[PDB]
Amino acid sequence: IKQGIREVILCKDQDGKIGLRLKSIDNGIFVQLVQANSPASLVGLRFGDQVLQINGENCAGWSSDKAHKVLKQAFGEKITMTIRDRPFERTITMHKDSTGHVGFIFKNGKITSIVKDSSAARNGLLTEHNICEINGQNVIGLKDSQIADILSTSGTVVTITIMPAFIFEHIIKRMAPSIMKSLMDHTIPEV
Ligand SMILES: CC(=O)Nc1ccc(-c2csc(N)n2)cc1
């Protein structure tokens, strides 16, 4: 989580696409969906990012449809957005026990239980939180099995980005769950 506002500059693809889906939360505008292999994925927009501006004009109070409308009508050689980094999320850093556990239980990507003497307990991991990222990778829509494997494949040190379930649910509506398994960029970032 970067604790300020950053700017990004977007360029429509061949198709006139930026690969981005926004959602009106609490009179902000927030990233509901980022498509793999898209300008938005390239410029490093993330699930749960706030869009403060688009081309200088402020996003306050705007409807999802409006924000989409604005992105369309704009001349696409250069779109400048102003982004607060995943405001609704935090990141927790755990260390696997020599059994390879960080030490929690989760179902549908929502952490349901924390285990005693676990790194997850020590680090103050919370339940009723939806897992958004692991080591930088968006894992939203992935089946619990696949998330489970990501945590398995990761090193000793694990990093989880989490989002209070009440908020996660509010964000990921107007979308099916295994649509998100498809559409949502789940790639490690390019460099
Ligand atoms: C700029 C723009 O119009 N973005 C946009 C609009 C709608 C959707 C969408 C709704 S349900 C689903 N599976 N995908 C995604 C992205």
- How many C-beta atoms lie closer than 10 Å to residue 139's C-beta? 23
Query: Is the same domain home to 78 and 98?
Result: no
Experimental method: X-ray
Q: What is the 3-state secondary structure (H, E, C) of 83-117?
A: EECCCCCEEEEEECECCCECCEEEECCEEEEECCC
State in Å: Cα 21 to ligand 1 middle.
Answer: 5
- How many C-beta atoms lie closer than 10 Å to residue 134's C-beta? 18
Asked if residues 138 and 46 have their Cβ atoms less than 8 Å apart, the reply is yes
- Spatial distance between the Cα atoms of 67 and 62, rounded to a whole number of angstroms: 7
State in Å: Cα 20 to ligand 1 middle.
Answer: 7
- Pocket of ligand 1 contains residue 175 by CB under 6 Å: yes
Asked if residues 79 and 18 have their Cβ atoms less than 8 Å apart, the reply is yes
Query: Is the same domain home to 43 and 73?
Result: yes
- Spatial distance between the Cα atoms of 184 and 37, rounded to a whole number of angstroms: 10
Q: Would 189 be classed as within a structural domain? A: no
Q: Would 32 be classed as within a structural domain? A: yes
Mutate to test the pocket of ligand 1, among 68, 79, 171, 178 (most ligand atoms within 8 A of CB): 68
Residues facing residue 157 across a β-bridge: 95
Residues facing residue 107 across a β-bridge: 110
* 108 carries a ligand binding annotation: yes
Q: Would 190 be classed as within a structural domain? A: no
- Pocket of ligand 1 contains residue 129 by CB under 6 Å: no
Residue with CA at minimum distance from ligand 1 atom 6 = 21
Give the residue from 52, 84, 116 where a domain finishes: 84
Which amino acid, 27?
A: N
Residue 9 structure tokens: 């500059």
Domain count, the chain: 2
Residue 171 structure tokens: 């964000």
Which amino acid, 121?
A: A
Max Cα–Cα distance, the chain, nearest Å: 55
Which amino acid, 3?
A: Q
Q: After which residues is the chain broken (C to N over 2.5 A)?
A: none
Asked if residues 101 and 118 have their Cβ atoms less than 8 Å apart, the reply is yes
- Pocket of ligand 1 contains residue 46 by CB under 6 Å: no
State in Å: Cα 174 to ligand 1 middle.
Answer: 9
Residue 39 structure tokens: 């300008």
Give the residue from 28, 63, 84 where a domain finishes: 84
- Spatial distance between the Cα atoms of 138 and 150, rounded to a whole number of angstroms: 11
- Spatial distance between the Cα atoms of 17 and 71, rounded to a whole number of angstroms: 9
State in Å: Cα 144 to ligand 1 middle.
Answer: 25
Query: Is the same domain home to 45 and 106?
Result: no
Q: Would 13 be classed as within a structural domain? A: yes
Question: Among 106, 156, 95, which residue's Cα sits nearest to residue 132?
Answer: 106
- How many C-beta atoms lie closer than 10 Å to residue 47's C-beta? 26
- Pocket of ligand 1 contains residue 21 by CB under 6 Å: yes
Q: Which residues contact 73 (CB under 8 A, 6 or more apart)?
A: none
- Spatial distance between the Cα atoms of 139 and 104, rounded to a whole number of angstroms: 17
Containing domain of residue 157, as a range?
Answer: 90-183
What single DSSP character describes residue 184? B
- Pocket of ligand 1 contains residue 71 by CB under 6 Å: yes
Q: Would 151 be classed as within a structural domain? A: yes
- Alpha helices for the chain (secondary structure H): 39-43, 64-73, 119-122, 144-153, 165-171, 177-183
Number of residues that this document lists for the chain: 191
- Pocket of ligand 1 contains residue 132 by CB under 6 Å: no
Resolution value in angstroms? 2.2
Asked if residues 142 and 47 have their Cβ atoms less than 8 Å apart, the reply is no
Give the residue from 84, 116, 135 where a domain finishes: 84
Residue 109 structure tokens: 């990507």
